[PDB]
């Protein structure tokens, strides 16, 4: 009876381990799948960067949003080296809108020494005068945040909906 | 109006940066409109006391300005609803939102604005006659049982300008207008009264009537007074809703308002189902007791502010209903939990611990609550009369009477109905201690008892004395062994046994004996005490005269009388007439006298 | 011996299971891919700037 | 919803104990989450407690070690803590913060919810009616637990309450098999265990036991070891209760949640209050402790319009076996009933030693009854209670006087007491006695006595049950 | 005389609790012994 109990205990523990490993394998496969989808989204967005016509409008919106955020007498904007005239024009367009919006006089500079890394697909980082407050309003950060916020909808699309969930609220 | 909302040192937050506004004023915070009350003022800024959660409140949030303090809406439709500590129409919000949890930003009026009511004017007052605060100008047939009267708000008067005819109108509509010296003010069907003030009365009359109770136990031993103040110990499993239901069904009051703290849905649904089940045949017809109730309760969860505001909401509602010339019983359940609520509100005040954290003004709150009761002549022309009783169910911490609150409450009440769990374990109901229970309002009731009975008080004194003498003889016969004692005290033993087994128990599961009329109780007690006196006199006289009369001779000659006494309780006054019962009891007493005569 | 054969067969069956659910998941992705990506890129593109709701003059 | 960017900082006014303080903040909010970056790149989360003007106060979970005054990137999420709930939590093991620790991937969230969540409307509360069998004879036979009956287990140092909890978890089940065998295949039971303030050996023993029983398909475990940061110890109960509410009121499952060593939770609340620099209370505990424990415990029961329920089984230790300690006292004014474990019975080597004499239950009146089970549950419990009481009394009287003075009934009482303490309480770790088998063994013990001495069982059932 | 002599301290609370419990157990034991003695007395003084 001692040996029988030992054998059956070994049977049960082995089978439980196999079940656990199988479920974990399934979950890891799903995680890799969603990661691949997000990487494709990154790549497609990086492709879309190239079209200058709408990239100018996007940069205008990004700069306006940063200016609306920081709301301080001094401001500095940071952008890739290769897009310098674009940010110049966008800022010269953005300043009067900010004045007409907030009813305050501010001064905006562009730095000429430190720049975004080469690998940056695009975006903008806005510092204050004393470089102690910032909003890295960069394209990849927006992609990550927007994807993480909409994650349950992504799962709903890629794997339907679970019938056992009867109610939503 | 800047929301300068700070952080918290508890479940409450504060704010600042506003203009001058009086304290104890209710304003709203954020886009969620959370309940807030000004407490502290310094400079041009004021702390606030928010009741809901403090999560997600940000700087720069609006703070709406108002002009009224914490108050309770008062009007028709209150009867039959379920409210929290801050008067939220909880059934109505569950109906509106179809939600599971407590929704936020609850901007729903305590009463609906789409239900019409049948209006009967006073048909005596004419436009131009001067009306003072507290005079009835209208009545509503809220339900067949109770008619929700309507009175002019207190602190108002003037010469009437318009009177509305009978019709089907809502709350917002105008039915009465008048004109004070200089201005004129309309009046709808709803009035609002701040919680922390007492509505006025003309004068306070002494309580001079007994509060009826269902069973002869604690109604002939230790009666309560209508409009009085009483303490009843009670705990889980002992049975506390027995007295609640007894006062709801078989009593002379007119409305029941049940207020507690940390209540369960069990009691809510139980009273809801007892409304159509535990009915009352006022005119031979059953009717839902929902019409005679207005439930108020808070469950742990509720922020301690609302949990502590529930008691004041309840007493305000009870007073608004007593002003209509009725009778009330306010079950102040969960008294120890209410002291805990007081401790909890004082937790976020850093106040000096008077005793185990009790705030210094604990006694002030006790006095301000328990005293607002009694019988009062109402303030108006038709001269009504009505009273509010309060029944604070004591809930000791495991039988230890060490709480200062318990002693403080036990010094204000005059009536005490002690409960012993072990007597309930002995299968004896109602479980009454029979020695610690008392009633010092006996003096107030002597005058009632004389004018209609002229015998009960001697019987009630004899019963108490016999109850003590039986314990004395119990001590004697545990020392001796219950086998060596004279007959003179054995008759006391036997009568005490008979009173215990028949007169000091009333089965609420017996179909027809769930309510003993008091005249019946007087009859039974008179018959039993007459038997006791006759047997005692016979044995004492024959102890030396001749033919020593003993337990066996008496018992055998009165096996019939003993069984008839033991079967008195099976009368069924519901079907058999009262005249039949009294005549049969008189005949039984005659038979007792005849048997004792035939002995000698 | 019977138990060892049983574990072998059960492991084979469980691996067959994992294969079939993995294949089903892959097919489920391949069925609907472009819609979510277009939606996500559209959300990224949209800007709608504004000011903090609680700022005052 | 929110598409605005995130605002970081590098200003830090001052730091003190488990707190951090920084100013020039732009429109802060209460209980906002923050992500911090150190000079060495390590990342530590935190939560906001105090706000005033531009000044702000966060609280680092992982502890203030080597935070730099200038070179620190403090970042603001713009929201409050949100739980990534999902049904496929089941079979996983997480740490206190929710990050998986069983080598698996990040949670794939079906939805998000408030960590505090929302409290249940009292009108949508349904009185418990039916009982959930635990697999223990000492509890089931003598003491029923309705759905949602929040019953705590009082224990102290050295007592094996942990093993009892593990046994209850692995032996949990329903009584729906009373109807039919084929119809019991529709099982809808789940467990959410929340180890908190638990030393390593215990946490791993729980893990090993759960893996051994093979029922990991319906067990979600939250581990918080002793050496973990103290601030995370107050977050785990909220996470466990939120996941339980999800699985109950969204998928219509029955759930039994267990919390262990709540004294450690009380210690954590005491410490965070002391760091907050607030006035102490009685025994130094926070004044609002009753409110906090209330908003923790009560999330349980049944609601109309749903096919689902929750049942809270707290476990807590008693310092110095002090029954009047604040923690069990304030737990008494919320929960229902009391279970005890007797030190002497542990010293007698009787497992599991649940003392039946002081045990109570307020819902036992209606949790059992006719139709839902047999008609012979409550009366059997009362009779067995009386028999055990008189048996212990007769044992005491035998010790006082001697064996020569015993009557026949006294011998029967002593034999019943010995057989009861040998059979009923003694269950062994793995014996899964059903309710029916438990009543049968109670009858087996009661067979010692003549029917006449069994006066607490009505004759109506003695003419049916004694002759078997 | 009126009160035991010991300094107020928590260990003293536990100690006096133990003393009271020991007194109660001895009380119950000697009551049971007295009951046995009274029964013996009654049955030897029977007839």
Brief sketch in words of this structure:
This is part of a larger assembly, with chains A (169 residues), B (600 residues), C (57 residues), D (468 residues) and E (47 residues). Chain B is α+β, with helices and mostly antiparallel strands.
Secondary-structure element string of chain A: HHEHEEEHH
Using only CA atoms, what is the Rg of chain A?
Answer: 26 Å
The gyration radius over C-alpha positions of chain E equals 18 Å
Largest sheet features of chain A: 4 strands, mixed
The number of helical segments of chain A is 5
* Strand order within the widest beta sheet of chain A: 2-1-3-4
Q: What does the largest sheet of chain E look like? A: none
Q: Helicity of chain A, in percent?
A: 55-70%
Strand content of chain A: 5-15%
SS-derived structural category of chain E: mainly alpha
GO molecular function, one term (chain A): proton-transporting ATPase activity, rotational mechanism
Family (chain A): Belongs to the V-ATPase E subunit family.
Protein name (chain A): V-type proton ATPase subunit E 1
Subcellular location (chain A): Apical cell membrane; Cytoplasmic vesicle, Secretory vesicle, Synaptic vesicle membrane; Cytoplasmic vesicle, Clathrin-coated vesicle membrane
Characterise the protein shown here.
This is part of a larger assembly, with chains A (169 residues), B (600 residues), C (57 residues), D (468 residues) and E (47 residues). Chain B has 600 residues and is an alpha+beta fold. Chain B is built from 15 helices and 26 strands. Helices cover 33% and strands 18% of the residues of chain B. In chain B, strands 16, 19, 20, 22, 23, 24, 25 and 26 form an 8-stranded mixed β-sheet that branches. Chain B has a 4-stranded antiparallel β-sheet with strand order 3-2-1-4, with no helix packed on it. Chain B has a 4-stranded antiparallel β-sheet with strand order 10-9-7-12, with no helix packed on it. Chain C is mostly helical. Helices cover 74% and strands 0% of the residues of chain C. Chain C is elongated. Chain D has one domain: Rossmann fold, CATH 3.40.50. Helices cover 30% and strands 18% of the residues of chain D. In chain D, helix 10 crosses helix 11. The chains are: A alpha+beta (169), B alpha+beta (600), C mainly alpha (57), D alpha/beta (468), E mainly alpha (47). Chains in contact: A-C, A-D, B-C, B-D, C-D, D-E. At the B-D interface, helix 1, helix 3 and helix 5 of B face strand 5 and helix 6 of D. Strand 4 (133-138) of chain A pairs antiparallel with strand 1 of chain D, so a sheet runs across the interface. The PDB classes it as membrane protein. Keywords: V-ATPase, synaptic vesicle, membrane protein.
């Amino acid at each position: 009876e001692k040996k029988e109990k030992q054998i059956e205990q070994q049977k049960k523990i082995q089978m439980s381990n196999l079940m656990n490993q199988a479920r974990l394998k399934v979950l890891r496969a799903r995680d890799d799948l969603i990661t691949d989808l997000l990487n494709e989204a990154k790549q497609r967005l990086s492709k879309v960067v190239k079209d200058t016509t709408r990239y100018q409008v996007l940069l205008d919106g990004l700069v306006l949003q940063g200016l609306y955020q920081l709301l301080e007498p001094r401001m500095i904007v940071r952008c890739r080296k290769q897009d310098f005239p674009l940010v110049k024009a966008a800022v010269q367009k953005a300043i009067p809108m900010y004045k007409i919006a907030t009813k305050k006089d501010v001064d905006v500079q562009i730095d000429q020494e430190a720049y975004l890394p080469e690998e940056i697909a695009g975006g903008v980082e806005i510092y204050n005068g004393d470089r102690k407050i910032k909003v890295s309003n960069t394209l990849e950060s927006r992609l990550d945040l927007i994807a993480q916020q909409m994650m349950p909808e992504v799962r709903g699309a890629l794997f339907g909906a679970n019938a056992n969930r009867k109610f939503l609220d | 109006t800047f929301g300068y909302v700070h952080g918290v040192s508890g479940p409450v937050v504060t704010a600042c940066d506003m203009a001058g506004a009086a304290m104890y004023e209710l304003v709203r915070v954020g886009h969620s409109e959370l309940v807030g009350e000004i407490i502290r003022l310094e400079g041009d800024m004021a702390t606030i006391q928010v009741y809901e959660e403090t999560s997600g409140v940000s700087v720069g949030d609006p703070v709406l300005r108002t002009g009224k303090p914490l108050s309770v809406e008062l009007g028709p439709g209150i009867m039959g609803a379920i409210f929290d500590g801050i008067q939220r129409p909880l059934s109505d919000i569950s109906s509106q939102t179809q939600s599971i949890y407590i929704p936020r930003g609850v901007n729903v009026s305590a009463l609906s604005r789409d239900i019409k009511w049948e209006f009967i004017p006073s048909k005596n007052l004419r436009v131009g006659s001067h009306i003072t605060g507290g005079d009835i100008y209208g009545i509503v047939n809220e339900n067949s049982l109770i008619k929700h009267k309507i009175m002019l708000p207190p602190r108002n008067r003037g010469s009437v300008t318009y009177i509305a005819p009978p019709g089907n109108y809502d709350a917002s509509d105008v039915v009465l207008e008048l004109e004070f010296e200089g201005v004129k003010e309309k009046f709808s069907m709803v009035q609002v009264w701040p919680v922390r003030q007492v509505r006025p009365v003309t004068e306070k009359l002494p309580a001079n009537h007994p509060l009826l109770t269902g069973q002869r136990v604690l109604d002939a031993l230790f009666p309560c007074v209508q409009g009085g103040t009483t303490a009843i110990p009670g705990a889980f499993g002992c049975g506390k809703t027995v007295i609640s239901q007894s006062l709801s069904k078989y009593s002379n009051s007119d409305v029941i308002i049940y207020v507690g703290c940390g209540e369960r849905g069990n009691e809510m649904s139980e009273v809801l189902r007892d409304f159509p089940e535990l009915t009352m045949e006022v005119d031979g017809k059953v009717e839902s007791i929902m019409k005679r109730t207005a439930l108020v309760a808070n469950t742990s969860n509720m922020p301690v502010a609302a949990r502590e505001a529930s008691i004041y909401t309840g007493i305000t509602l009870s007073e608004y209903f007593r002003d209509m010339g009725y009778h009330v019983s306010m079950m102040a359940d969960s008294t120890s939990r209410w002291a805990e609520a007081l401790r909890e509100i004082s937790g976020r005040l850093a106040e000096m611990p008077a005793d185990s954290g009790y705030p210094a003004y604990l006694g002030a709150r006790l006095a301000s609550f328990y005293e607002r009761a009694g019988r009062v002549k109402c303030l108006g022309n038709p001269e009504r009369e009505g009273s509010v009783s309060i029944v604070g169910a004591v809930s000791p911490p495991g039988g230890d009477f060490s709480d200062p609150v318990t002693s403080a409450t036990l010094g204000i009440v005059q009536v005490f109905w002690g409960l012993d769990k072990k007597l309930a374990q002995r299968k004896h109901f109602p479980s009454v201690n029979w020695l610690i229970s008392y009633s010092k309002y006996m003096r107030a009731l002597d005058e009632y008892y004389d004018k209609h009975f002229t015998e009960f008080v001697p019987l009630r004194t004899k019963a108490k004395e016999i109850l003590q003498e039986e314990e004395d003889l119990a001590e004697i016969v545990q020392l001796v062994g219950k086998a060596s004692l004279a007959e003179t005290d054995k008759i006391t033993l036997e009568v005490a046994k008979l009173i215990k087994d028949d007169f000091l128990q009333q089965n609420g599961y017996t179909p027809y004996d769930r309510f003993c009329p008091f005249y019946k109780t007087v009859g039974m007690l008179s018959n039993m005490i007459s038997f006791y006196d006759m047997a005692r006199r016979a044995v004492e006289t024959t102890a030396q005269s001749d033919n020593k009369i003993t337990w066996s001779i008496i018992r055998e000659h009165m096996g019939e009388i003993l069984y008839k006494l033991s079967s008195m309780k099976f009368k069924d006054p519901v079907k058999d007439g009262e005249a039949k019962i009294k005549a049969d009891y008189a005949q039984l007493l005659e038979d007792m006298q005849n048997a004792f005569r035939s002995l000698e | 011996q019977a138990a060892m054969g049983s574990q072998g067969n059960l492991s084979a069956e469980v691996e067959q299971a994992t294969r079939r659910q993995v294949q089903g998941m892959q097919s489920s992705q391949q069925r609907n891919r472009e819609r979510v990506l277009a939606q996500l890129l559209g959300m990224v593109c949209e800007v709608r700037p504004q000011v903090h709701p609680n700022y005052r003059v | 919803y929110l598409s605005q960017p995130r605002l970081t900082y590098k200003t830090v006014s001052g730091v003190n104990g488990p707190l951090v303080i920084l100013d020039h903040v732009k429109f802060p909010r209460y209980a906002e989450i923050v992500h911090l970056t150190l000079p060495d790149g390590t990342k530590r989360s935190g939560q906001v407690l105090e706000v005033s003007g531009s000044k702000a106060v966060v609280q680092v979970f992982e502890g203030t070690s080597g935070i730099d005054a200038k070179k620190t990137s403090c970042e603001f999420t713009g929201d409050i803590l949100r739980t990534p709930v999902s049904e496929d939590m089941l079979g996983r093991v997480f740490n206190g913060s929710g990050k998986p620790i069983d080598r698996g991937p990040v949670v794939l969230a079906e939805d998000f919810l408030d960590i505090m969540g929302q409290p249940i409307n009292p009108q949508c509360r349904i009185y418990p009616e039916e009982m959930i069998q635990t697999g223990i004879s000492a509890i089931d036979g003598m003491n029923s637990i309705a759905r949602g009956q929040k019953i705590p287990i009082f224990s102290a140092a050295g007592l094996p309450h942990n093993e009892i909890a593990a046994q209850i978890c692995r032996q949990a089940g329903l009584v729906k098999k009373s109807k039919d065998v084929v119809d019991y295949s529709e099982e809808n039971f789940a467990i959410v265990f929340a180890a908190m303030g638990v030393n390593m050996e215990t946490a791993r023993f729980f893990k090993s036991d759960f893996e051994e029983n093979g029922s990991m398909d319906n067990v979600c475990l939250f581990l918080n070891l002793a050496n973990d940061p103290t601030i995370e110890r107050i977050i785990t109960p909220r996470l466990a209760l939120t996941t339980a509410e999800f699985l109950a009121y969204q998928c219509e499952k029955h759930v039994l949640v267990i919390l262990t060593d709540m004294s450690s939770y009380a210690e954590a609340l005491r410490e965070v209050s002391a760091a907050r620099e607030e006035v102490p209370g009685r025994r130094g505990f926070p004044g609002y402790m009753y409110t906090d424990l209330a908003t923790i415990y009560e999330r349980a029961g049944r609601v109309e319009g749903r096919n689902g329920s929750i049942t809270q089984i707290p476990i807590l230790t008693m310092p110095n076996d002090d029954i009047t300690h604040p923690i069990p006292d304030l737990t008494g004014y919320i929960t229902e009933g009391q279970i005890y474990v007797d030190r002497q019975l542990h010293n007698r080597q009787i497992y599991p030693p649940i003392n039946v004499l002081p045990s109570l239950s307020r819902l036992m009146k209606s949790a059992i009854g006719e139709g839902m089970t047999r008609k012979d549950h409550a009366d059997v419990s009362n009779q067995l209670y009386a028999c055990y009481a008189i048996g212990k009394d007769v044992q005491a009287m035998k010790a006082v006087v001697g064996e020569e003075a015993l009557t026949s009934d006294d011998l029967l009482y002593l034999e019943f007491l010995q057989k009861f303490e040998k059979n009923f309480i003694t269950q062994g770790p793995y014996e899964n006695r059903t309710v029916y088998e438990t009543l049968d063994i109670g009858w087996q013990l009661l067979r010692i006595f003549p029917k006449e001495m069994l006066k607490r069982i009505p004759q109506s059932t003695l003419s049916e049950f004694y002759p078997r | 005389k009126d009160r035991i002599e010991i300094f107020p301290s928590r260990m003293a609370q536990t100690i006096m609790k133990a003393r009271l419990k020991g007194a109660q157990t001895g009380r119950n034991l000697l009551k049971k012994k007295s009951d046995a003695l009274t029964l013996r007395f009654r049955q030897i003084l029977k007839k």
